[PDB]
Amino acid sequence: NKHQQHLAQLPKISQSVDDVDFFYAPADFRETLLEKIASAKQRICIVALYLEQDDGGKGILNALYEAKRQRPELDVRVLVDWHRAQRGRIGAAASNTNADWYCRMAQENPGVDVPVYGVPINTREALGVLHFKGFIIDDSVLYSGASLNDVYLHQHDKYRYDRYHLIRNRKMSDIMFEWVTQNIMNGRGVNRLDDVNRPKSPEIKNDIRLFRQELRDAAYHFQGDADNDQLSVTPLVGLGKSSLLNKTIFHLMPCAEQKLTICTPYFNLPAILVRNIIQLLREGKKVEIIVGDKTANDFYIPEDEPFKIIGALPYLYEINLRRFLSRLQYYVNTDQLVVRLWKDDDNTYALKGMWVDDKWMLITGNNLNPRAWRLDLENAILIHDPQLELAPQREKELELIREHTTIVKHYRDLQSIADYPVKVRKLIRRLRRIRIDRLISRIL
Numbered sequence: 001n002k003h004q005q006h007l008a009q010l011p012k013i014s015q016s017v018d019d020v021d022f023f024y025a026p027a028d029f030r031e032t033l034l035e036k037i038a039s040a041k042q043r044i045c046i047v048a049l050y051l052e053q054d055d056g057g058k059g060i061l062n063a064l065y066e067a068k069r070q071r072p073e074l075d076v077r078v079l080v081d082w083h084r085a086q087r088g089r090i091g092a093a094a095s096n097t098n099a100d101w102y103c104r105m106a107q108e109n110p111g112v113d114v115p116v117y118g119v120p121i122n123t124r125e126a127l128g129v130l131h132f133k134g135f136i137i138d139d140s141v142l143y144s145g146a147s148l149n150d151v152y153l154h155q156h157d158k159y160r161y162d163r164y165h166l167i168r169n170r171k172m173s174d175i176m177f178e179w180v181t182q183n184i185m186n187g188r189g190v191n192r193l194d195d196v197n198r199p200k201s202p203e204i205k206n207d208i209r210l211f212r213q214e215l216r217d218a219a220y221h222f223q224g225d226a227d228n229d230q231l232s233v234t235p236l237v238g239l240g241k242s243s244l245l246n247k248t249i250f251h252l253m254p255c256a257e258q259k260l261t262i263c264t265p266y267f268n269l270p271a272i273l274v275r276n277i278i279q280l281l282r283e284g285k286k287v288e289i290i291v292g293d294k295t296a297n298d299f300y301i302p303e304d305e306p307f308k309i310i311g312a313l314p315y316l317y318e319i320n321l322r323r324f325l326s327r328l329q330y331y332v333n334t335d336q337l338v339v340r341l342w343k344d345d346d347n348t349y350a351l352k353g354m355w356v357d358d359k360w361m362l363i364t365g366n367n368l369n370p371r372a373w374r375l376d377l378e379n380a381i382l383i384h385d386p387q388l389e390l391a392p393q394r395e396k397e398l399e400l401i402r403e404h405t406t407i408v409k410h411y412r413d414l415q416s417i418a419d420y421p422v423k424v425r426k427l428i429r430r431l432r433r434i435r436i437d438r439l440i441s442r443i444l
């Protein structure tokens with residue numbers, strides 16, 4: 001079996017069960033992060049899509065400044081997306097940016113250096129973003145898809161559901177930390193957001209081009225020290241067709257002997273992944289797909305509030321799901337295909353991951369969409385648990401993930417375009433007439 005061989009031959013870093021901690025809620029993740037910031041003695045590397053200027057973001061940044069204040073020799077770095085940091089939300093009131101905020105924070109803390117870098121994966125945000133996940137603190141990585149804001153940290157009443165794994169592993173964290181240092185920190189495109197005279201994009205357009213071309217080769221290189229019959233972790237990083245992550249995602253699915261479970265908050269599977277699923281289904285195996293309700297998509301705008309064009313995305317992601325469910329309705333009937341809609345009032349959904357049987361767990365920022373396949377800098381940690389040492393945590397986590405879901409029993413239980421609000425419905429129909437929906441899909 002060529003797929004199983006790929007996995008068997010992946011380099012693997014030995015992992016102690018006692019150096020792996022699951023957390024099951026945003027608040028716990030927040031507290032853990034604050035716990036580790038205060039405790040860190042060597043380094044703190046925060047890579048995130050963004051670090052918002054809200055109570056959540058402030059909480060984390062204040063704690064970083066405080067850590068550096070009490071340990072000047074501490075190596076503290078924040079890396080966020082260059083483009084995202086220099087704008088407000090799409091279709092919101094143009095405002096003070098996070099980058100401006102980063103500048104005020106430096107000014108307001110004169111003695112203490114917490115460099116905030118901005119990482120452009122492409123010259124336009126829409127064609128590439130920093131989707132590298134990981135908070136690297138000393139010998140450990142607190143790993144999550146979460147960015148740093150109110151909802152992701154559950155600062156107040158609303159939350160955004162992600163996953164949270166802390167892994168103490170000297171070798172892995174070193175590999176991840178050094179990679180970030182070598183391939184991002186010093187690198188053409190990367191500029192400091194905590195500087196009022198930071199450049200604009202026209203000046204670095206060619207720096208970004210060469211940066212992307214070097215990241216096209218983005219990979220980790222390390223010797224394996226663990227065999228395929230012991231708990232291990234395999235850090236994976238990638239961008240584009242050369243991504244080892246994407247190839248590992250590809251080969252994982254067919255390795256399922258019983259069941260595959262997939263999480264994504266943006267359901268838009270590349271054809272090659274859909275074929276994997278169909279294969280599994282045709283072999284009598286089970287496939288579980290846990291996606292958010294459109295109302296739990298962070299692009300969703302309620303009927304109440306004025307409609308904005310970006311608010312059409314969750315509808316498109318649902319169209320994708322309904323089309324996918326309609327094709328495979330037989331397997332829903334046989335109870336092999338289980339599609340779960342997640343919804344918890346107006347809380348939002350951001351879960352990623354793959355589970356292959358009870359043996360592999362992929363924790364990743366990868367949303368298994370065209371964005372991750374072609375555009376964005378993605379990473380992951382692949383946990384191999386052959387002796388089932390993490391079974392209590394795996395089972396507990398999935399139990400909690402599934403709690404606020406309902407199983408789709410037929411595809412027509414999902415709304416069709418006809419049922420959508422008049423402005424959305426109209427917009428979407430026009431896009432489908434002139435096949436623009438097929439085009440936009442590639443950046444979704």
Ligand SMILES: CCCCCCCCCCCCCCCC(=O)OC[C@H](COP(=O)(O)OP(=O)(O)OC[C@H]1O[C@@H](n2ccc(N)nc2=O)[C@H](O)[C@@H]1O)OC(=O)CCCCCCCCCCCCCCC
Nearest residue numbers: 049084089090091125126129298299308309310312443444
């Ligand atoms: C009214 C004006 C109309 C004009 C529209 C054109 C404007 C385009 C320029 C901006 C392009 C943004 C690209 C973002 C890609 C990204 O973050 O990709 C990664 C992301 C998943 O990252 P993950 O780590 O999983 O985390 P999140 O899910 O929290 O990431 C969501 C990001 O999106 C931001 N956001 C969310 C809601 C909102 N209203 N505005 C925001 O800025 C958040 O602040 C955050 O940065 O994957 C995605 O986000 C998947 C969707 C990609 C969007 C594709 C480009 C924009 C749509 C296309 C234009 C046509 C309109 C639609 C017509 C049907």
